[PDB]
Swiss-Prot record, chain A:
Protein task: Attaches the virion to the cell membrane by interacting with host receptor, initiating the infection. The major receptor is host ACE2. When S2/S2' has been cleaved, binding to the receptor triggers direct fusion at the cell membrane. When S2/S2' has not been cleaved, binding to the receptor results in internalization of the virus by endocytosis using host TFRC and GRM2 and leading to fusion of the virion membrane with the host endosomal membrane. Alternatively, may use NRP1/NRP2 and integrin as entry receptors.
Top-level taxon: Viruses
Protein name: Spike protein S1
Result for mutant: residue 1 to K: In strain: Mu/B.1.621
Annotated organism of origin: Severe acute respiratory syndrome coronavirus 2
Subunit structure and binding partners: Binds to host ACE2. RBD also interacts with the N-linked glycan on 'Asn-90' of ACE2. Cleavage of S generates a polybasic C-terminal sequence on S1 that binds to host Neuropilin-1 (NRP1) and Neuropilin-2 (NRP2) receptors. Interacts with host integrin alpha-5/beta-1 (ITGA5:ITGB1) and with ACE2 in complex with integrin alpha-5/beta-1 (ITGA5:ITGB1). May interact via cytoplasmic c-terminus with M protein. May interact (via N-terminus) with host bilirubin and biliverdin, thereby preventing antibody binding to the SARS-CoV-2 spike NTD via an allosteric mechanism.
Length: 49, 49
């Protein structure tokens, strides 16, 4: 159950190793626009939040 | 660089290159104008010598 648009969730992601290769096993994704980063280089960067 | 694609990191780097290249043009132009002033002073000092 995704929440409706006026009251959206906000999951804060704490400490992990983040394999983004997953998230590539869900569908065709009508979209997928990475803005500040380029999506081919996500598995080699550190983020804070 | 380690955050964008060969065709997307080209515009952002070109902006920085232009900015810092302008910095060098400002620097060198002022050194030429200021070197003419110390040269005129060295000519006066040689003449007094």
């Amino acid at each position: 159950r995704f929440a409706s648009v006026y009251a959206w969730n906000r999951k804060r992601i704490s400490n992990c190793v983040a394999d983004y290769s997953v998230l590539y096993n869900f569908a065709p994704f009508f979209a997928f626009k990475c803005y500040g980063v380029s999506p081919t280089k996500l598995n080699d960067l550190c983020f804070t939040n | 660089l380690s955050r964008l694609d060969p065709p997307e990191a080209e515009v952002q780097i070109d902006r920085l290159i232009t900015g810092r290249l302008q910095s060098l043009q400002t620097y060198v132009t002022q050194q030429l104008i200021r070197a003419a002033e110390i040269r005129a002073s060295a000519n006066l000092a040689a003449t007094k010598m």
